[PDB]
Coordinates of C-alpha atoms and ligand atoms in Angstrom, one line a residue:
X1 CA -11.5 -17.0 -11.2
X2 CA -9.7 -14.1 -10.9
X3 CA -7.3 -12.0 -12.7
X4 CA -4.1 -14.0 -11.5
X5 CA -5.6 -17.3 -13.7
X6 CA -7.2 -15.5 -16.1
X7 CA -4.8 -12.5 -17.3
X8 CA -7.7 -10.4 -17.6
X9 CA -8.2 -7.3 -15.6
X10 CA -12.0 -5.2 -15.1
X11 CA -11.6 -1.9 -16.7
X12 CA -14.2 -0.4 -14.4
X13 CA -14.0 3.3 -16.1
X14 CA -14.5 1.8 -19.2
X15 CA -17.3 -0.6 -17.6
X16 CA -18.9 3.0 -16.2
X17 CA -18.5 4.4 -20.1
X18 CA -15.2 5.9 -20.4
X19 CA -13.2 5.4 -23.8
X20 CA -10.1 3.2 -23.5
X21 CA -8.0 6.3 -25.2
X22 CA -9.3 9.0 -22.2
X23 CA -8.3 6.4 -19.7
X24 CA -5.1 5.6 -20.6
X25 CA -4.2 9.3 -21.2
X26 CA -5.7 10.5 -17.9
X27 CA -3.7 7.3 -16.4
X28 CA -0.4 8.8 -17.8
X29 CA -1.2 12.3 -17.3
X30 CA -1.3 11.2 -13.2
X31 CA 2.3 9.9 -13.5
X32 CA 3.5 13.1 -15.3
X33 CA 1.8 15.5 -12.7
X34 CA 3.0 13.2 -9.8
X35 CA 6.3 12.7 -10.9
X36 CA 7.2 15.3 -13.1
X37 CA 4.3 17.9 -12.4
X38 CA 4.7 21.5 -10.7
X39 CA 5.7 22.2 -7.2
X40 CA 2.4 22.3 -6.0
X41 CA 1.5 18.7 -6.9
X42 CA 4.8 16.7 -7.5
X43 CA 5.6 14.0 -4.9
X44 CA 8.7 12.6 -6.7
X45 CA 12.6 14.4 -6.7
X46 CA 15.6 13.3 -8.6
X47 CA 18.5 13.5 -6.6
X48 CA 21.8 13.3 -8.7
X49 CA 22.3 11.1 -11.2
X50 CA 21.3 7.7 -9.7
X51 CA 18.7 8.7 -6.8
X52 CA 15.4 10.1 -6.1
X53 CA 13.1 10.0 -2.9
X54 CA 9.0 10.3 -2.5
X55 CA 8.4 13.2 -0.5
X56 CA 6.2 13.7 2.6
X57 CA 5.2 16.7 1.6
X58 CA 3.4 16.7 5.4
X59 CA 5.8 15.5 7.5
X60 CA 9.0 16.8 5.4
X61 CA 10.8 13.5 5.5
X62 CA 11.5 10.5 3.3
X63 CA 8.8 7.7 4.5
X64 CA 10.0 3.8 4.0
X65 CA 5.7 3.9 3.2
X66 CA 6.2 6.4 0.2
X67 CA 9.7 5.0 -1.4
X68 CA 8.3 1.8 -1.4
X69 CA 4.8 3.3 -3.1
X70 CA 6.7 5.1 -6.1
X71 CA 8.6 1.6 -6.1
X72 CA 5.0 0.0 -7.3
X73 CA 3.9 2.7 -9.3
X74 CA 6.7 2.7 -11.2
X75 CA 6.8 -1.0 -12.4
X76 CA 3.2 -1.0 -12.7
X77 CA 3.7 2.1 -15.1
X78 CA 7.0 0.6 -17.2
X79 CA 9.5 3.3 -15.5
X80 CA 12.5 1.5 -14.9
X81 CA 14.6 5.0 -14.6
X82 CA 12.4 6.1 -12.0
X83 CA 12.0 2.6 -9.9
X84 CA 15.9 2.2 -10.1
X85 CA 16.5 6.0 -8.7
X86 CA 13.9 5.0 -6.3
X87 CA 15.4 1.4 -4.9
X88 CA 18.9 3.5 -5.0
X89 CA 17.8 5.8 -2.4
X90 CA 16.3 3.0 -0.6
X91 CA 19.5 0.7 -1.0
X92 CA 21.8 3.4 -0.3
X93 CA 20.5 5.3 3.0
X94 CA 17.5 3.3 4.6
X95 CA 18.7 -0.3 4.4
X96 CA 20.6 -1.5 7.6
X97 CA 23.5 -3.5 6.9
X98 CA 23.7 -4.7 10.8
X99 CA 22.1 -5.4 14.0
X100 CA 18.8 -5.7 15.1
X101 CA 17.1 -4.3 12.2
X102 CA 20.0 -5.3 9.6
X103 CA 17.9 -6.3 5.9
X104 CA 15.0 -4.1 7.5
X105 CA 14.7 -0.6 6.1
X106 CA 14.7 2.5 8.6
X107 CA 11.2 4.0 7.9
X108 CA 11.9 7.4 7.7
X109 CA 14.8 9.9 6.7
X110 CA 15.4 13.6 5.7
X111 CA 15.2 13.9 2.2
X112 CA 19.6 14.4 2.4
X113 CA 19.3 10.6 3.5
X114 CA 20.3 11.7 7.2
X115 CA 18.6 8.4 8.9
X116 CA 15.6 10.0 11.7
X117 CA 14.9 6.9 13.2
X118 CA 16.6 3.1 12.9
X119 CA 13.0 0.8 13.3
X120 CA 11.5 -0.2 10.7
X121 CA 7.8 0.3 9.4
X122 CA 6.6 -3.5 7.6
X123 CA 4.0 -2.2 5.2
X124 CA 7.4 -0.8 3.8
X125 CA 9.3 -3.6 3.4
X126 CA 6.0 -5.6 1.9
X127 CA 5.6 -3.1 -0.4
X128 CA 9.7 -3.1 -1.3
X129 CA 9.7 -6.9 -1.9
X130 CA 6.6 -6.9 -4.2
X131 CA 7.6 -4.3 -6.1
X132 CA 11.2 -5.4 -6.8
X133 CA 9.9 -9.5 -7.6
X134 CA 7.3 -7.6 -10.3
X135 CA 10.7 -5.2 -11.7
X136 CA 12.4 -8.9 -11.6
X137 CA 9.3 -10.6 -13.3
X138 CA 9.1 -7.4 -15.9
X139 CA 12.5 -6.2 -16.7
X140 CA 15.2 -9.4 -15.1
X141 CA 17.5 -9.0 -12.7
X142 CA 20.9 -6.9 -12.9
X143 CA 24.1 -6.4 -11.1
X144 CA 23.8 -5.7 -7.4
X145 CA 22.0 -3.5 -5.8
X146 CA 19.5 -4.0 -9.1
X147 CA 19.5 -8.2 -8.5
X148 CA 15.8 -7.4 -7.9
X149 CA 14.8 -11.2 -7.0
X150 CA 17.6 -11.9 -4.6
X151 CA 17.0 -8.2 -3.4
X152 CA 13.5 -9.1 -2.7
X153 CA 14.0 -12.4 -0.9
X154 CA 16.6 -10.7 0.9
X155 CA 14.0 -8.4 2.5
X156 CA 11.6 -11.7 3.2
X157 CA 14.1 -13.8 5.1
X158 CA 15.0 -11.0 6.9
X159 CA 11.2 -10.5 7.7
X160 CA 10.4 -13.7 8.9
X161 CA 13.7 -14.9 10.7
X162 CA 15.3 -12.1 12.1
X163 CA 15.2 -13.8 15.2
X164 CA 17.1 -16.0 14.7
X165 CA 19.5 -13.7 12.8
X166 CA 20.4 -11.9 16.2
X167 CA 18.5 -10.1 18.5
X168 CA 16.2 -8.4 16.5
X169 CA 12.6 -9.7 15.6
X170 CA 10.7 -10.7 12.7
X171 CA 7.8 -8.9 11.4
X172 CA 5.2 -11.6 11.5
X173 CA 4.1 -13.1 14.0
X174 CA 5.4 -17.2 13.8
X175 CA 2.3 -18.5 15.3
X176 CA -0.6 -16.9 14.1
X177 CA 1.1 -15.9 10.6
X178 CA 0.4 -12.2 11.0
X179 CA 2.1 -9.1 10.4
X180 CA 2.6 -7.0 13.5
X181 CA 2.6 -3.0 13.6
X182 CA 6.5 -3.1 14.5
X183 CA 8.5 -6.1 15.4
X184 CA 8.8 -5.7 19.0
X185 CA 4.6 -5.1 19.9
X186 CA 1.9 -8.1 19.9
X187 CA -0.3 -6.6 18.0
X188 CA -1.2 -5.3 14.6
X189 CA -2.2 -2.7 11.6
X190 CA -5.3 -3.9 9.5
X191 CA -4.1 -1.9 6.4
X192 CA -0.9 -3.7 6.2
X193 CA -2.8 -6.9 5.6
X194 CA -1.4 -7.8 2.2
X195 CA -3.1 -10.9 1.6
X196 CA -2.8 -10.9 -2.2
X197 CA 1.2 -10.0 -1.8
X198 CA 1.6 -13.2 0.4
X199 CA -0.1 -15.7 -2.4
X200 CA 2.7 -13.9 -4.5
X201 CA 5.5 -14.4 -2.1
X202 CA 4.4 -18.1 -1.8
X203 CA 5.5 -18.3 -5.9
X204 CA 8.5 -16.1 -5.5
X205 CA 10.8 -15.8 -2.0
X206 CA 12.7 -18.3 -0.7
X207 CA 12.0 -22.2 -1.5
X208 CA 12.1 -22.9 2.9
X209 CA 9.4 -19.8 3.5
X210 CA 6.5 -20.6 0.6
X211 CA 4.9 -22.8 2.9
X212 CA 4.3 -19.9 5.2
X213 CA 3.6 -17.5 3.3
X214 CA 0.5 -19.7 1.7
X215 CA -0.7 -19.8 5.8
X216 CA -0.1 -15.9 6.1
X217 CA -2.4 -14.8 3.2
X218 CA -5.4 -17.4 4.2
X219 CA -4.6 -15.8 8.0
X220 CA -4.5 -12.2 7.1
X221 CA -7.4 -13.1 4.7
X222 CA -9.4 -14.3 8.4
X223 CA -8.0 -11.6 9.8
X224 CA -9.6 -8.9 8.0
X225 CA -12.7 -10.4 8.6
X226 CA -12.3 -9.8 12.2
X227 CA -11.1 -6.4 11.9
X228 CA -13.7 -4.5 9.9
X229 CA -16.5 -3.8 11.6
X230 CA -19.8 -6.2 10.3
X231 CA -22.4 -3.1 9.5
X232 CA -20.0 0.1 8.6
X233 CA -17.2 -2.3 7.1
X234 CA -14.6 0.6 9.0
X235 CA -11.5 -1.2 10.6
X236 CA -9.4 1.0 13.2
X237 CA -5.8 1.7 12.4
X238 CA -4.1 -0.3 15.0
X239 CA -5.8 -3.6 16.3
X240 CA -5.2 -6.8 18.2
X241 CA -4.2 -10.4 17.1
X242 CA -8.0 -11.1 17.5
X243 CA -9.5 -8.1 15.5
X244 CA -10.3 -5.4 18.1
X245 CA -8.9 -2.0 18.1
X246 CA -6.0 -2.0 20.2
X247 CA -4.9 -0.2 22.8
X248 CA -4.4 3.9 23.0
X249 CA -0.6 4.1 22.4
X250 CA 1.8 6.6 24.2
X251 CA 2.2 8.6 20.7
X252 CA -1.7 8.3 19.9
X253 CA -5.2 6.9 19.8
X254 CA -5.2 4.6 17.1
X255 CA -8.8 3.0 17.6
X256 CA -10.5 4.9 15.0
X257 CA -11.2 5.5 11.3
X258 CA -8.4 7.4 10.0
X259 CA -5.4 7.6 7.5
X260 CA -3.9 4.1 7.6
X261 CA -7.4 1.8 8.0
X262 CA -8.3 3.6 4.3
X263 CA -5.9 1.0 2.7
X264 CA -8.1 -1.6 3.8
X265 CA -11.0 -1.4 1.5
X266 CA -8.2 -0.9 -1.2
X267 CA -6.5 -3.8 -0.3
X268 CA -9.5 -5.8 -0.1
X269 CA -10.8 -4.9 -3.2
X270 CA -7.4 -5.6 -5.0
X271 CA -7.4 -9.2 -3.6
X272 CA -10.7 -10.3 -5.1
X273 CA -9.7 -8.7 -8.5
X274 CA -6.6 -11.4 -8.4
X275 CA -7.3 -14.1 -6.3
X276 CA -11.7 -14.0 -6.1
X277 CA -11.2 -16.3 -3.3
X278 CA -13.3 -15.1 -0.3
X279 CA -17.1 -13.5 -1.5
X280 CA -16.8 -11.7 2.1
X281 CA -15.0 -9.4 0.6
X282 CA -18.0 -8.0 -2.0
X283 CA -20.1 -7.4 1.0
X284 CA -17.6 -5.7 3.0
X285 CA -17.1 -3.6 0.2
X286 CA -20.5 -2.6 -0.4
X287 CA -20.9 -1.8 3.3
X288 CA -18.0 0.7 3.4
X289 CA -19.1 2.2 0.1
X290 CA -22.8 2.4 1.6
X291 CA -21.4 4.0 4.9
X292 CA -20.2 6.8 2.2
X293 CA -22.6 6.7 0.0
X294 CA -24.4 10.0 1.2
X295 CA -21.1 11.8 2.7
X296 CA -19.7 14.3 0.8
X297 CA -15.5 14.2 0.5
X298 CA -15.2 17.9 2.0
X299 CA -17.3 16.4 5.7
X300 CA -15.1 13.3 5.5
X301 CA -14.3 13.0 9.6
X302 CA -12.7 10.8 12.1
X303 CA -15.1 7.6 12.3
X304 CA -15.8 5.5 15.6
X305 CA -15.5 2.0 13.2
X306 CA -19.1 1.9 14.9
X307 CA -19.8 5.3 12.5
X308 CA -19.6 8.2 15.3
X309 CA -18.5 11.4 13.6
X310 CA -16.0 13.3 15.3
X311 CA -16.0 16.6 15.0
X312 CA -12.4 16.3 13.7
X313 CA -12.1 16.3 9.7
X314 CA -10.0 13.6 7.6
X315 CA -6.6 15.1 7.2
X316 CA -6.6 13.2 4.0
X317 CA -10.3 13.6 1.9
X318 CA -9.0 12.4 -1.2
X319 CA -7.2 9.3 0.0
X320 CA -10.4 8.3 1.3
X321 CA -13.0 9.0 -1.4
X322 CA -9.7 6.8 -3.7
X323 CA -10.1 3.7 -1.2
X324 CA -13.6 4.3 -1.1
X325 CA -13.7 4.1 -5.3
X326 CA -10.6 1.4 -5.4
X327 CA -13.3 -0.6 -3.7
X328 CA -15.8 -0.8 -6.7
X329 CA -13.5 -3.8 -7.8
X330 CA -14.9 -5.9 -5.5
X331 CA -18.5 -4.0 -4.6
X332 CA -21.6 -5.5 -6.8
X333 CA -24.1 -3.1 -5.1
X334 CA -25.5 0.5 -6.2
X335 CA -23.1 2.7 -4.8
X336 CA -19.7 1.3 -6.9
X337 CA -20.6 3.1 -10.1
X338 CA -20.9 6.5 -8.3
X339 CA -18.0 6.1 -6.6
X340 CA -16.2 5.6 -10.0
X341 CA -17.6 8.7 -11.1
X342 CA -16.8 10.5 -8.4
X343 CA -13.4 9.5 -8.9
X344 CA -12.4 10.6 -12.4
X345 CA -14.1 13.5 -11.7
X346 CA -11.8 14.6 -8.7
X347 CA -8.1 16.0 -9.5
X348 CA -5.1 15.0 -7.0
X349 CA -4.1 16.9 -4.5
X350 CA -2.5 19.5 -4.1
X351 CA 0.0 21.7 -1.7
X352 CA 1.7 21.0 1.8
X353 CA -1.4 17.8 2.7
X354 CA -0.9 16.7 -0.7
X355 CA 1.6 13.4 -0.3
X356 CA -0.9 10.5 0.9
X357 CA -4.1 11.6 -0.5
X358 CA -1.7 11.3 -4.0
X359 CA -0.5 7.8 -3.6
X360 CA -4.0 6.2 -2.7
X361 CA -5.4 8.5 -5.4
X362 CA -2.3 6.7 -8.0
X363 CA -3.1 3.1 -7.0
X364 CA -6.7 3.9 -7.4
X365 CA -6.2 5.2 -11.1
X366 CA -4.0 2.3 -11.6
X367 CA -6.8 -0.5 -10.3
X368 CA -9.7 1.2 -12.0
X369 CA -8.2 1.2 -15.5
X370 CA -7.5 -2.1 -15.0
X371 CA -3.7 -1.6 -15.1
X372 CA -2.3 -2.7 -11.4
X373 CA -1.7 -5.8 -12.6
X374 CA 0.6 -9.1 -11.4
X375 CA 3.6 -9.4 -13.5
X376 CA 4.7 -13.5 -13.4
X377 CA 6.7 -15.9 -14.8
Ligands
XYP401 O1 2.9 8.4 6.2 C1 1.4 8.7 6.2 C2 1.2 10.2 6.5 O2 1.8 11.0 5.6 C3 -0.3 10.5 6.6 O3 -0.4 11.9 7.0 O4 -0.9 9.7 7.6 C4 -0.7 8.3 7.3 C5 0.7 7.9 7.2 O5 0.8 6.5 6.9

């Protein structure tokens, strides 16, 4: 049974030794160093009164990705001020009001607001309606734009019917019950396989949708079994309908072990913590963490999901060795306490890199304190 029926949540620090009072002030002191911290290390920037956007500190720009992150974070940390600021933004500047895309979020800005691009990104939107049904479950809804639950459902109908709304698309796919990399390609991203966040939507959006939404986390659950490769456990960043790394896109090879496919063993990991529902997932933990096992951070590369090194270091060390960790929730074997170790021992990142190594290294404090938790009822 897993923490969804149970309301009880492994404390894995504390199951590795740590005192309950260390981890819940090293918990908090990652919130006031990412939000609040110095200009090295911060992520997070009020904007006004009302406002405040996640920073790509990399790319310079305002990611649908990153707003969406400090959106969880925040209710998973009690900061209503700071989630409301967040959704603001959001509301305000990224959400399209028509067209194709109208209800979908455009995924990037400048930090002004100045939209960069109109098509969405959907581990954004995901990510947006999650977090606003747990601020609903947590805090209740308020006036527009903070009617978090209608906000959130909003975002859903919009994600599955679209089609129907006009000429735009939806961002799963109707007949295999997967989410696609953008609405208009057939195929998909294995790290925005949410499966977790779908049994969640199947309790919370719209009455006509639940239905599908209970076939979409079984699917994506399938899914991810197809993706990750059976002896490495490594999944490329963009693959097919059927599992296989898709093809090399016009803006980039996307075949390989890199930034996005790190969410994976998080996400996995997260699902058998609430749901325990498919023991796959403890071995494909256990193989990823045993493909690590012997690598130091600082020689993280690009993988071949088959475990070819490039030459080619991670851009993002510390996001990895976080999913890598994140994955002892799941992993029985003799690597997870290491990786725990490992993990409290290492400090976020920081400087111009710092932004997506932070938020994986967040969620990753979050899970292994025992604190990302479902908020109900
Ligand atoms: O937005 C993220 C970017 O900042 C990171 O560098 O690569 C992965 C992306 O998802």
């Amino acid at each position: 049974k897993g923490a969804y029926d149970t309301g009880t949540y492994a404390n894995l620090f504390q199951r590795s030794g740590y005192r309950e009072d260390e981890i819940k002030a090293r918990l908090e002191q990652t919130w006031n160093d990412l939000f609040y911290g110095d200009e090295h290390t911060r992520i997070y920037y009020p904007v006004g009164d009302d406002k405040g956007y996640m920073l790509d500190t990399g790319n310079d720009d305002v990611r649908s990705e990153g707003m969406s992150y400090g959106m969880m974070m925040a209710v998973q940390m009690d900061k209503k001020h700071e989630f409301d600021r967040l959704w603001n933004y959001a509301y305000t500047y990224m959400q399209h009001t028509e067209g194709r895309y109208k209800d979908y979020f455009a995924w990037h800005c400048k930090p002004d607001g100045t939209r960069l691009s109109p098509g969405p990104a959907p581990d954004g939107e995901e990510f947006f309606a999650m977090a606003l049904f747990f601020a609903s479950n947590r805090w209740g809804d308020g006036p527009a734009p903070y009617d978090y639950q209608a906000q959130a459902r909003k975002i859903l109908h919009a994600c599955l019917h679209q089609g129907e709304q006009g000429e735009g698309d939806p961002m799963w796919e109707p007949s295999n019950r997967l989410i696609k990399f953008i609405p208009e390609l057939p195929f998909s991203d294995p790290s925005y396989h949410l499966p977790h966040f779908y049994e969640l939507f199947a309790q919370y959006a719209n009455e006509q949708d639940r239905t599908f939404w209970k076939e979409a986390a079984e699917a994506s659950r399938a899914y991810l079994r197809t993706a990750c490769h059976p002896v490495t456990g490594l999944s490329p960043e963009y693959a097919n309908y059927d599992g296989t790394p898709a093809p090399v896109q016009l803006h980039g090879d996307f075949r390989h072990f890199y930034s996005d496919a790190y969410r994976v063993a998080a996400n996995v990991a997260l699902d058998w913590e609430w749901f325990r529902k498919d023991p796959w997932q403890v071995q494909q933990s256990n193989r990823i963490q045993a493909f690590f096992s012997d690598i130091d951070v600082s020689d993280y590369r690009r993988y071949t999901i088959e475990g070819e090194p490039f030459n080619e270091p991670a851009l993002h060390p510390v996001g990895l060795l976080a999913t890598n960790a994140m994955a002892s929730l799941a992993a029985d074997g003799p690597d997870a306490d290491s990786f725990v170790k490992r993990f409290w021992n290492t400090p976020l990142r920081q400087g111009k890199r710092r932004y997506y190594d932070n938020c994986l290294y967040f969620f990753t404090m979050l899970a292994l304190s025992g604190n990302y938790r479902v908020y109900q009822q």
